[PDB]
Amino acid sequence: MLEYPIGTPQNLAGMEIAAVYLQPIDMEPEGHMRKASESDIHIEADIHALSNNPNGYPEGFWVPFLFIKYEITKVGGSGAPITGDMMAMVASDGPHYGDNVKLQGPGKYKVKYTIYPPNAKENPMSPYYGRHTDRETGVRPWFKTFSVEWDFTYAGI
Amino acid sequence: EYPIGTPQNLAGMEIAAVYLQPIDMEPEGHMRKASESDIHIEADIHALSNNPNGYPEGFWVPFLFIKYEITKVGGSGAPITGDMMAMVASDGPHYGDNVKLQGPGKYKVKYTIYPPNAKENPMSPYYGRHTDRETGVRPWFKTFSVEWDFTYAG
Ligand SMILES: [Cu+2]
Ligand SMILES: [Cu+2]
Ligand SMILES: [Mg+2]
Ligand SMILES: [Mg+2]
């Protein structure tokens, strides 16, 4: 697959957090994504387990059932961020968190993701994902909600 | 960890049925208490090579919904039924449930596997699939069932 990286990946709580973008996409179920024709990019959060992940994920595994909120701000622009929620989905290169986004033209942008664990109150998937807690097969508690930021230059794609 | 027959390959996925001792899970109150159960039943679903839904080989297939039916051979004939739940343990993510059985003997285990877009799947509103030429994948598989036989000895 072809993609454009946003800065350098960041490591927290036994996970690698990377930001990427590509052209707007089409998704099933329809009507969840902003129409490809009314967007500039498809923004994505690539979250994979590092070695010795404390929540039982083997290295390189996709970290599922997370909830991601983003804020995108143009440097030198209005000052008001472009906000939204990402959705979990699968593409030809595998599962990820993404959203179709309309930007404010070419320039430098600041990107911030707020990453919610499976048990967060804000996470709508919390009733559907468990975690073993017994000695034999149990794992460490979930990480706390955190935020991650990068800068990037958008030219149009 | 005890295997239930041999894994089966369908729709670019490997499906294995296993069991182990009953477990404890967060959030509490979803699993049947370990003290009131005999086994923790599990469905191990991983992508094969050339999986049609975009999963690289060996990846856990997420957002599925699994229903099981366990019947004792020679017993009442009425199956033990339930729903599995997606969860993570020390060996990774899987679908599982704490189950009370009907003593030692031979059992028939059937799993019904629902794709992310199935009406029966409560996670359907939360998982998408790219459909465009560049990044898209093939449609989801249709709901299917897999069966095995196994001897339980505690
Ligand atoms: Cu996407
Ligand atoms: Cu389990
Ligand atoms: Mg990717
Ligand atoms: Mg296991």
CB contact under 8 A, B62 and A61: no
Whether the CB of A122 is below 8 Å from some CB of chain B: the reply is no
Distance of CA A23 to the CA centre of its chain: 16
Which residue among A93, A129, A134 sits closest to B86, beta carbon to beta carbon? A129
Whether the CB of A87 is below 8 Å from some CB of chain B: the reply is yes
Whether the CB of A31 is below 8 Å from some CB of chain B: the reply is no
Sheet with A129-132: list strands edge to edge.
Answer: B2-10, B13-20, B39-47, B92-99, B85-89, A129-132, B25-26
The set of residues, in sequence order, having a beta carbon less than 8 Å from that of B154 and lying 6+ positions away, is B38, B104
- Cβ-based neighbour number of residue B74 at 10 Å: 7
| Stated resolution in angstroms | 2.2
Q: Ligand 1 mean position to B77 CA, how many Å? A: 46
Distance from CA of B91 to the nearest CA of A (A): 6
Q: Tell me the C-alpha to C-alpha distance, in Å, between residue A47 and each of A69, B48, B109, B129.
A: 14, 21, 35, 17
Distance CA A5, CA A58 (A): 24
Angle, vertex CA A51, rays to CA A92 and CA A120, nearest 5: 75
Please state whether B34 falls in left (phi above 0), alpha (psi between -120 and 50) or beta.
alpha
CB contact under 8 A, A130 and B63: no
